[PDB]
Amino acid sequence: TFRRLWPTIAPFKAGLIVAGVALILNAASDTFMLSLLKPLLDDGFGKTDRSVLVWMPLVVIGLMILRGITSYVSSYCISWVSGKVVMTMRRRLFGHMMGMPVSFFDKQSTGTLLSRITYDSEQVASSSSGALITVVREGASIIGLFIMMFYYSWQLSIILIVLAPIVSIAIRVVSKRFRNISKNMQNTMGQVTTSAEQMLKGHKEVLIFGGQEVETKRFDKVSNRMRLQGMKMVSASSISDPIIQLIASLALAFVLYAASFPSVMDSLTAGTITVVFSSMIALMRPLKSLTNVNAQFQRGMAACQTLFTILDSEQEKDEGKRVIERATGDVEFRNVTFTYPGRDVPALRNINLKIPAGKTVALVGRSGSGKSTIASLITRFYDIDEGEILMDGHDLREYTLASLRNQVALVSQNVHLFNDTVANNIAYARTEQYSREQIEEAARMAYAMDFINKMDNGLDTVIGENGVLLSGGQRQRIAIARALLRDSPILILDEATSALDTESERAIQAALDELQKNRTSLVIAHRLSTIEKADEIVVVEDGVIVERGTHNDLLEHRGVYAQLHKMQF
Amino acid sequence: TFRRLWPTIAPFKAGLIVAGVALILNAASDTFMLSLLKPLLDDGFGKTDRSVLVWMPLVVIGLMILRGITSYVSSYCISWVSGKVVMTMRRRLFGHMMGMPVSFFDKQSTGTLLSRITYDSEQVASSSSGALITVVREGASIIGLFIMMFYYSWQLSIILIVLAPIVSIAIRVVSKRFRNISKNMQNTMGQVTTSAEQMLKGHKEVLIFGGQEVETKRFDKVSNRMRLQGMKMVSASSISDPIIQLIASLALAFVLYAASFPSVMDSLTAGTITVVFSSMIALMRPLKSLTNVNAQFQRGMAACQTLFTILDSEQEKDEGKRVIERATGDVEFRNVTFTYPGRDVPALRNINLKIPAGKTVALVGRSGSGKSTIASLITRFYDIDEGEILMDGHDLREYTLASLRNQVALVSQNVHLFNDTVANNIAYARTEQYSREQIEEAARMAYAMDFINKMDNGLDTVIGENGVLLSGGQRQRIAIARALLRDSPILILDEATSALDTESERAIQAALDELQKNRTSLVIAHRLSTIEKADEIVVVEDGVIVERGTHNDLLEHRGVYAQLHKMQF
Fold first, then answer.
1. What SUPFAM superfamilies does its record include (chains A, B)?
2. d(Cα A490, Cα A375) in Å, to the nearest integer?
3. Which end of chain A, N or C, is less packed with Cβ atoms under 10 Å?
4. Does residue B445 sit at the A interface (CB-CB below 8 Å)?
5. Inter-chain touch B114–A195, beta carbons under 8 Å
6. Quick one: which of A485, A495, A551 has its CA closest to A525?
7. CB contact under 8 A, A260 and B50
């Protein structure tokens, strides 16, 4: 429709200009090929001299060489412009990906966001490249062949370009009329076959009454009706092709009789008629390619505008300005109601949860997964619909999102591994600040050191995809090591791995216990031992608290703690 | 295999042969058009302004007119051959199909059996016509074009037909080389899209750990990898077209440089070169049409063997030569096990039905299976698997089938009415035997006289499909009137009409009583009055008999009929 992509093809534009120059060569080279047909017939084979026909093969070989180099450099420079625009468009899209909110990542588009970031961007790049290729190459071919036909024999060019649309609309009206005849006769066949179904019910009603011969005569009559109807079908269908070919050659007869009647003619010698005939025979293809230009361009800018509304979605709401280096204050829920966007059911109703600093708080009692929201609220993955959660007496909306995300650590079994070293994956965004010996120490306590000895390069081995594909318990150990490196004041772990490694699960629990000796920890518990280590347990069924207290208080008051001990046993 | 249909085209093959007299000429005309390219260039505008340029437009007009008439008569004569072969094929298929058993028609494929009559045999005729046209038209085109080759410029023709396989194998090997370069190529950027998938997947961890800048910096490197891989793709796919045009025009330059030899020219003359190049560029199409000849033959002849499987298959087993004139004898079932072919469960266990002469026997079973085929075993629709049914002490297998089906009358609401007149519908297959006054006499006790006078014509109107159409009880009244005209000794009824006609359904029962006043009557019943009108009652559940005897005897004994009776209420 309308491009604001012109600034983001601004620094590469001259390269496209060079590309355009190549296409200005390219079709013109083809034009010269058609011009090369002129000395062949009039001078080369016609006259008895050999001199034009030794001029022929080197010149046509040079033109083909020049067409080859100009096509290579045309596609190379259009690939440069398309590649650099998909470079900067992909980079700007991914830059507006990582600060943009999580609500697009709620199973709206996960695998097709790869399509949005890759396939749509190469689609608009290739569409603009092919659109420029089509427009400028077939435009150069059209204007070259037009100036060719006007230069060599302008009169016959004029009358033959006059004769092309009248025979074209003659083909159109003949095809329309015969298509009307065809569809009416398809209806007539419909009628002839509705009578043919009657014989198939006939079969049963024939053998029950012994009427094979009378049904044979009636099928003879109706099948003669099919034969006559099909005779008129194939006659009317195959009368089309001689008619269209006859009116098409009426134009050829008009040109050839028109080479004699206007007695000022005969300006053409021998080869120029072959030149202009091959000119329109080879010109019928650029016009057909130019008809699809607006459709290709509209599809490409449709993909571009889809990518533009992908870019047009805003980032996080970062209206807060409270920068806090160390958030040792208590996080406290105050009647917070939160709803999933696009879902009518409220994901969380009003909750007065209290998390003291240092004291370990557990969260149990889920129906489905009600704690998945709660693990995300303090990190502010999702915005709160109503209510306030206070840290240091301050709401998270008052906080900056960067510092608030800095004070939170997240450890889980599904921790995805970046395609970097082990020491880089432990130390995301802090590798420059932390010394490598500190990553080694964090590995020492995290009890993952034996496994870091296991790969070849030690702490510098790649560990993500197309790497070692490290075990999920060791992925958990990696996440604990990240937690010891960050030393965030709060802790949140799902523990819903449900797979216990031989003596490595005990090391995982021990490393988590060293990690949670200091600072607070809000734990989603699947291990029963982690319920014993919990100082506080808050039982929330979906969005409402069932119970709040220490585990010996629910050892007497049953509630749904009996159901929790049931599904733990 | 091959054909075995030549006798089926043998009386009409002369209409094929004159078609060939068209077809070769249709291609000869095209050859003559290319022959017209020789005096138009050399003897045309170069030498004389006049004379020849009166000849060429009129000759082109005459050749195109002749092409039109020969294409019209070619299509009409091949339409004659295809219409006559589909004529005799549909006649033979239907005439064999009428005696062919109902066991194929029990929902194997009833919708496609109309296609087996029309579409499959039309595919056979159209494929044979297309195969013959594709052989002989482009065969004469190839032969005439090679005659044009060897008549004009012998040396250039022989070297050009030498050079065309060389450029063909060269274009094949370079296409194969660039293609498996592409299939070797296309995995490497897919491995980069895996890294992009992991990078966009780690959005949550990039948010919580605060690593947007590092992910942007690494996305720059991986997107540079995508740009380089796309560069290599576009370069590798781009370098094909200069290579293909370079090798094609290398072949063209070979022809031109070999034409620079003075031995070859001096026979090539002024013109005579455009006809040869145009002969190859026209040939590019008949050879491509001829290479599909075996596929076009084989698809249609596979359809022909499929139809020949239906044409030669099974028939009625009619090893009984006992003609029966009047079936006054009692129908007696005796330990008769019948199973539907292709079905696991036996549809009928060993039952010993007795049908005494002039006595009403009623089948009132509610099972929905097993008893409906009893109405088909009496007509020998399905053959006996075990046991014996004897009529007048004689088995119906030992009876003549045609006389037996003469002895059966069938009345139901599922009766099919033919496309003939309603007078021909009542007296169907015996309208020569019975007079029109006898048909009106049968209509008198049929109580259908008001519906006959309701029609536009009266007694001789058409009642079937694409006709006046008839109500369901009035469609039954055709079958009661057909029963009075046939006066068969046995009755077979359905009684599934839950809907009852106002003041005519009781008249339908009155006409049925008129018919049942004499002779045997086996009735399938659901209406209570049909049960009360029974002389004898036999109720069958699944394939087994549960109660035999009159309505009073089953009115005393509870058994199975009483709960059936309460279900009827």
1. ABC transporter transmembrane region, P-loop containing nucleoside triphosphate hydrolases
2. 11
3. C
4. no
5. no
6. A495
7. yes
For B276, the token pair is: 């040869």
Measured between alpha carbons, how far is B290 from B142 in angstroms, rounded to an integer?
A: 10
Experimental method: cryo-EM
Cβ atoms < 10 Å from Cβ of A337: 15
- Shortest alpha-carbon distance between residue A556 and chain B (Å): 39
Looking at the fold, whether B37 and B135 belong to one and the same domain comes out as yes
SS3 B541: strand
Chain B contact for A284 (CB, 8 A cutoff)? no
Confirm or reject contact between B220 and chain A (CB < 8 A).
Answer: yes
Q: Which amino acid is residue A491, in one-letter code?
A: L
CA distance B191 to B198: 11
Angstrom distance (rounded) from CA B419 to CA A198? 7
Task: Name the residue facing A253 among B60, B71, B256 (closest C-beta).
Answer: B60
Give the DSSP letter string of B472-523: HHHHHHHHHHHHHHHT-SEEEE-----S--TTTHHHHHHHHHHHHTSS-EEE
- Residue B160 shares a structural domain with residue B263: yes
Q: Which of B:309-338 have CB within 8 Å of A?
A: none
d(CA A276, CA A271): 9
Nearest to B491 by CA among B321, B363, B402, B400: B363
Are A330 and A492 within 8 A, CB to CB? no
**CB nearest B249 (choices: A60, A95, A97):** A60
Tell me which residue in B118, B194, B405 faces A210 most closely, judged by beta carbons. Answer: B405
Q: Inspect the interface and report whether the beta carbons of B94 and A216 lie closer than 8 Å.
A: yes
Is A95 in the B-facing interface, judged by CB distances under 8 Å?
yes
A266 → closest Cβ in B45, B224, B243: B45
Q: What are the Cα distances from residue B452, in Å, to A415, A508, B442, B475, B479?
A: 85, 95, 12, 12, 14
Contacting residues of B for A252, CB less than 8 Å apart:
60
How does strand A536-541 pair with strand A360-364? parallel
A-chain CB neighbours of B268 within 8 Å are 45
- In which domain, by residue range, is A351 found? 331-568
Task: Give the N- to C-terminal CA distance of chain A in Å, as an integer.
Answer: 64
Can you tell me which residue has the tokens 């599922």? B414
Residue B540, classed as helix, strand or coil, is strand
B227 lies within 8 A of chain A by CB:
yes
Q: Is B90 on the interface with A (CB under 8 A)?
A: yes
A51 domain residue, yes or no? yes
Answer for the pair B80, B12: CB distance below 8 angstroms, yes or no.
yes
Which residues are B544's β-sheet partners?
B541
| Dist. CA A238–CA A235, nearest whole Å | 5
> Residue B44 and residue A270: Cα distance in Å, rounded?
8
B158 with B147, same domain: the answer is no
Query: Is residue B277 in a domain?
Result: no
Output the six-digit token pair for B254: 């070979």
| A260 in B contact zone (CB under 8 Å) | yes
The CATH number assigned to the domain holding A110 equals 1.20.1560.10
For the purposes of burial, counting CB atoms within 10 Å of the CB of B183, is it exposed (0-12), middle (13-18) or buried (19 or more)? exposed
| A429 and A376 fall within a common domain | yes
**Among A497, A128, A534, A82, CA closest to A297:** A128
A196 and A139 in a common domain? no
Residue matched to tokens 């009206």 = A173
Q: Give the total number of structural domains in chain A.
A: 3
Q: How far apart are CA B50 and CA A265, in angstroms?
A: 11
Do A290 and A380 have their domain in common?
Answer: no
Looking at residue A9, the DSSP 8-state letter turns out to be G
